[PDB]
Each structure stands twice: as C-alpha cells, then as structure tokens.
Amino acid sequence: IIGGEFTTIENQPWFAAIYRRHRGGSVTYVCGGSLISPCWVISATHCFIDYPKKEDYIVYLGRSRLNSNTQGEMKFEVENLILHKDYSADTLAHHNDIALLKIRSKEGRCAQPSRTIQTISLPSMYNDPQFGTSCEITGFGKENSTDYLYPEQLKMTVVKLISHRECQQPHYYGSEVTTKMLCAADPQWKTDSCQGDSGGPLVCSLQGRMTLTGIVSWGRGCALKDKPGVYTRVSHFLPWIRSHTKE
Ligand SMILES: CC(C)c1cc(C(C)C)c(S(=O)(=O)N[C@@H](Cc2cccc(C(=N)N)c2)C(=O)N2CCN(C(=O)CCN)CC2)c(C(C)C)c1
C-alpha cells in the first residue's frame, strides 16, 4: 500500500494473508485475501494461476505481521483451491480475477471467530456503493514502487470509487476496464494499493454494513496520476461464488 497508515488485524479482522511453501523451507508471501465464511477465503486467481497446487499454500488469519507471529493468529491449509475457469490476462486488464480457498487447520476445523478473526459480508446482487464513495483496502504490499520488500506491519488506506465512465476514458484505461471491474483511487493520486496487495479486500460501508465490494486485481504502476486501481466487482460474481461454495 502506497501512502496510507499502518494498522493491526483488530481493525481488519477479515484479512487473510496467503503464503506459498517452497522446496526447502522458505515461505514467501503471495497475496492477500478475505474471509467470507468460516471455511472460505476469497482472493484473486492471478495470484495462483502459475502454481495451482493447493499444498504449496498457507493461509493466516488474525495476523498483523509479515514475518512474525501475532497472538491469537490461526494457521490453515488449503483444502480446495478454486480458480475461475474464464480467467485471462491481457496487456493490463486481468479478467475474472477471483478465487476461492477452502481452508482447514491440521485438526480439520475451520476459522473460529474472535476479536481478531471476523468474516466480512458479501454484497447483494448488483448492489454496489454509489460512485464517489470512500472505501478501504488492506495489505502487505509495497509502500513505493522502488521497493523490493514488503512492509512487516499491515497497512491500509482509503480510496474513492470511480465510475465506469471516468475509468473508461482514453487517458485512464480505455475499453480495457469492463463492467465486471471497479476503479478506485485517491483523488490526489497520493495513496493506492500496489504489488502485493493483490487478492486483498476493497471494503465499503454499504448501508451501515461493512461489505466486500472488490478484490485488488490490477493497475498501471502504483499511485500514478489517472491510473486507478482496478478491482474485481464482487457483486457480479455472486452466482459463481455461491455455486462453488455449496458443494
Ligand atoms: C505480470 C507483469 C506483466 C506485470 C504487470 C503489471 C500491470 C501492468 C498489470 C505490473 S504493475 O506494476 O503495473 N502492476 C502490478 C502491481 C498492482 C497490483 C494491484 C493494484 C495496483 C494498483 N495500481 N492499485 C498495482 C500488477 O497489477 N500485477 C498484477 C499482475 N501480476 C501477475 O503476476 C499476473 C499473473 N498472471 C503482477 C502484479 C507489473 C510490475 C512488476 C511492474 C508487472
């Protein structure tokens, strides 16, 4: 997250941190995620497409730090990795960038709700926040594009939702951005999500209820003028989300 402020998981209880195991012992960070149900975490397919093995992944809940433990944190295995069948990646745009991770501890149990581990609500069919509304994004992504390391402490920021008309502009993203995507950016282009925040939540207060409006998907650079962060419009994937979570 470029700019913004540092925070704790107590403020982002639904945040999931996803790591990938490696041949040997190293465990690098992959992407963020959001707990939508005790046994389900939603993220971005682009984060896993190259390594479809569910065994190489580790999901953390109630974790505020990148390389260290947090009291009350929970470690999970990926019981099932569901990638969207129609995912594709063009020059900049990443289509159907959504994924589901059924998690399970070593005991075979799911996420036990606590003060540091809560599930965030999904939106109603096509019911999204009106454009110009403030929403938050969380992650362990880069603080500057020049950085090659992720910040140890969890970061967050507020961005404003941008209409499909403004984002579809020539100097913005042209026709690359579709109706299945949302644009959000700082009106001053000072704060934005960046490499590493992918798969993380874009939460909006919809009708007095915290909702998972989008998933950090793509964007040209980080916090560049007229280059908003593009998010997967969670409200257009409800059917897909429901059919794959049932059984
Ligand atoms: C993969 C490669 C072609 C590549 C593509 C791109 C974009 C043009 C899509 C970049 S960027 O800074 O402009 N963008 C990176 C980082 C990013 C992510 C999410 C949101 C923002 C935002 N502005 N708010 C920025 C990115 O989109 N992604 C998502 C795509 N991704 C993948 O690996 C997809 C794998 N199929 C890399 C990180 C990079 C950086 C290393 C310079 C590398």
Curated annotation (Swiss-Prot):
It comes from the Eukaryota. Glycans are attached at N144. The active site is at H46 (charge relay system), D97 (charge relay system), S198 (charge relay system). Residues 1-246 form the Peptidase S1 domain. The modification Phosphoserine is found at S145. Disulfide bonds join C31-C47, C39-C110, C135-C204, C167-C183, C194-C222. This is Urokinase-type plasminogen activator chain B. It comes from Homo sapiens (Human). The chain holds residues 179 to 425 of 431 of the full protein.
